[PDB]
Design a protein around this ligand. Structure first.
Ligand SMILES: [Ca+2]
Ligand SMILES: [Ca+2]
Ligand SMILES: [Ca+2]
Ligand SMILES: [Ca+2]
Ligand SMILES: [Ca+2]
Ligand SMILES: [Ca+2]
Length: 642
């Protein structure tokens, strides 16, 4: 049983109805009792209770509840009383009935519900409202989106059976040609296959597609479709692979950033409470920093929160384990292409650049707009050229002039862009260790993200600018395991070769025991090897490395390793995650925000931009646009590149 709420052992329906009656007795009601009851009984038992109540009093429990309660807390409780099928119908009703139209709800339900659930859905709609669901849907949606929805409404998807490897491969190429190989996508094609083929078949098709293409099916869909259809087709895929994972992220999305999408939270927590709530939790914790319980506890309040925490629940299983494993498989096989946001300027004229720069700095005030239009629109290399030119033209150091004429975050941003990669990092590391305390966050981000070549370049740039070895510096500002671990990474001496299934299983065993060598493995093994090592870990312990690190490590030590693991799993994502935090909350960390924007502006910033929008449903553009302002915002948005 992967549900969070199960049948209450030895339950007295008649008494429960009596307790519900007495709970609402007098002015108001004993909400603490109502929630503890309803939330401690299966939807089936709730139906019996609601039944005994109708006879024992001749009143409607749901109608009565609707009166004695109010607010989100009411929607939740009343929603928990409605039969599964009739609950879905209500959600759909609200979505297509009113002012706007919740396509998010339409997609969540229609793309996840099974053939039976779908049939029980449309039936409950016609019964509860005496209206045709297909007609209502068809008349409230347009385009391929409407089509796909109607196809999903038929609930006539071929159900699991023996897979025909011949048809699987035929579908793999069919999809490939209908999408990846073309400018756009054959909607009619994807709708038919992704909508008719069995989940078991498609799952094997998706696996085949990645192994023979290099990228997951969604990678070929993303950006190749438009509007709600893209989202819908991306949701169907996710659901086919794992509905637990779908709701896992769908949930995270409803609580992400100030303000909650309570309507989605209640719908999901209620609908999956007796299906895969447990797996969703196992996946949520693994896929995200905070646990479902923690996220809900911090986003909701009152009885509404207490109820949600009860619905939630608070080793892996066939599902939660599959996802974790497949997560590493993808990261290991996926053929990703790193792309920056700022590219070399065409018709590059250093002489004209240095002139415009010199001009925009003369006088009392400093023309910053021009300074930004140039600097932020030139590759770090071209920038180094403007420095050379500027100097060999005016006999003055551009940096010194820039540093003096500029100030604040802007000065830090602009001057940061003018510094060569290896030197910017060196400066960063030096600052993190200067003064009182250590910017543990800065050191980790860098030392746990940079490569052997990058670390080598850094180690050198450091000795120069700051006559002292990067190690010596580290030993001066840090200590303990944090220092040992950091110093290790600062050696840029990690294995480069491919994976070794032999050593892998061995290394994996080391991680299993912990639940010095571990450090060596996480600091010495090549990323491709570690990727496999983690594959073997989930296969022999049933847990994910992240869980071993969290359970046996804490604080900085735990953050360096998690940073490393994340860097090996999905570097761009790790940065998108860090970029979100910097702008998360009332304040803003222009420091981290600036460091990441600059450092990755020419490596994989575009990649980060996508991982950001996909996971937080909002472009980095708007993300920055809302936090920063003035000239700091102008320059930043320049690096973002759209
Ligand atoms: Ca009310
Ligand atoms: Ca395509
Ligand atoms: Ca929130
Ligand atoms: Ca000036
Ligand atoms: Ca310090
Ligand atoms: Ca902020």
């Amino acid at each position: 049983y992967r549900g969070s709420i199960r049948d209450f052992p030895d339950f007295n329906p008649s008494q429960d109805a009596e307790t519900l009656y007495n709970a609402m007795k007098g002015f108001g009601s004993d909400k603490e009792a109502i929630i503890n009851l309803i939330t401690s009984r299966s939807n089936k038992q709730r139906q019996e209770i609601c039944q005994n109540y109708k006879s024992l009093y001749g009143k409607d429990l749901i109608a009565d509840l609707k009166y004695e309660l109010t607010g989100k807390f009411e929607r939740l409780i009343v929603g928990l009383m409605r039969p599964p099928a009739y609950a879905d119908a209500k959600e759909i009703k609200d979505a297509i009935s009113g002012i706007g139209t919740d396509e998010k709800c339409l997609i969540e339900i229609l793309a996840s519900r099974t053939n039976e659930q779908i049939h029980q859905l449309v039936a409950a709609y016609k019964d509860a409202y005496e209206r045709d669901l297909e007609a209502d849907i068809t008349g409230d949606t347009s385009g391929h989106f409407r089509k796909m929805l109607v196809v999903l409404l038929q609930g006539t998807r071929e159900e699991d059976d023996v897979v025909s490897e011949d048809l699987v491969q035929q579908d793999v190429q069919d999809l490939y040609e209908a999408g990846e190989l073309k400018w756009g996508t054959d909607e009619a094609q994807f709708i038919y296959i992704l909508g008719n083929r069995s989940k078991q078949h498609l799952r094997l098709v998706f696996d085949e597609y990645l192994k023979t293409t290099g990228k997951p099916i969604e990678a070929s869909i993303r950006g190749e479709l438009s509007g709600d259809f893209e989202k819908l087709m991306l949701a169907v895929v996710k659901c086919i692979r794992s509905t637990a994972e779908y709701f896992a992220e769908r949930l995270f999305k409803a609580m992400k950033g100030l303000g909650t999408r309570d309507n989605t939270l209640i719908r999901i927590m209620v609908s999956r409470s007796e299906l895969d709530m447990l797996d969703i939790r196992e996946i949520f914790r693994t896929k995200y920093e905070k646990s479902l319980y923690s996220m809900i506890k911090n986003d909701t309040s009152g009885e509404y929160k207490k109820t949600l925490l009860k619905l939630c629940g608070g080793q892996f299983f066939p599902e939660a384990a599959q996802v974790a494993y497949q997560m590493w498989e993808l990261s290991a096989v996926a053929r990703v292409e790193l792309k920056g946001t700022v590219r070399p300027a065409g018709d590059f004229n250093p002489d004209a650049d240095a002139k415009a720069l010199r001009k925009a700095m003369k006088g009392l005030g400093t023309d910053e707009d021009t300074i930004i239009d140039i600097i932020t629109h030139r590759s770090n290399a071209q920038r180094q050229q403007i420095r050379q030119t500027f100097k060999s033209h005016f006999g003055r150091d551009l940096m010194a002039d820039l540093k003096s004429e500029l100030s604040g975050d802007l000065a830090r941003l602009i001057l940061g862009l003018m510094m060569p990669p290896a030197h910017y990092d060196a400066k960063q590391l030096k600052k993190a260790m200067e003064g009182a305390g250590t910017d543990e966050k800065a050191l980790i981000e860098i030392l746990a993200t940079r490569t052997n070549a990058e670390i080598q370049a850094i180690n050198k740039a450091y000795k120069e600018d700051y006559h002292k070895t990067l190690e010596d510096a580290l030993s001066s500002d840090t200590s303990g395991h944090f220092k040992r671990i950091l110093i290790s990474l600062a050696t840029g001496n990690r294995e480069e070769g491919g994976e070794d299934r032999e050593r892998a299983r061995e290394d994996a065993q080391v991680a299993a025991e912990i639940l010095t060598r571990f450090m060596m493995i996480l600091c010495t093994r090549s990323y491709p090897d570690l990727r496999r090592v983690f594959q073997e870990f989930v296969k022999m312990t049933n847990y994910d490395v992240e869980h071993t690190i969290k359970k046996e490590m804490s604080g900085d030590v735990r953050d360096v390793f998690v940073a490393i693991v994340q860097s090996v799993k999905n570097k761009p994502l790790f940065f998108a995650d860090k970029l979100y935090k910097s702008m998360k909350g009332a304040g803003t960390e222009e420091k981290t925000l600036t460091r990441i924007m600059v450092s990755r502006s020419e490596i994989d910033l575009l990649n980060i931009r996508r991982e950001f929008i996909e996971k937080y449903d909002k472009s980095l553009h708007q993300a920055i646009e809302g936090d920063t302002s003035g000239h700091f915002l102008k320059a930043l948005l320049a690096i973002c590149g759209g």
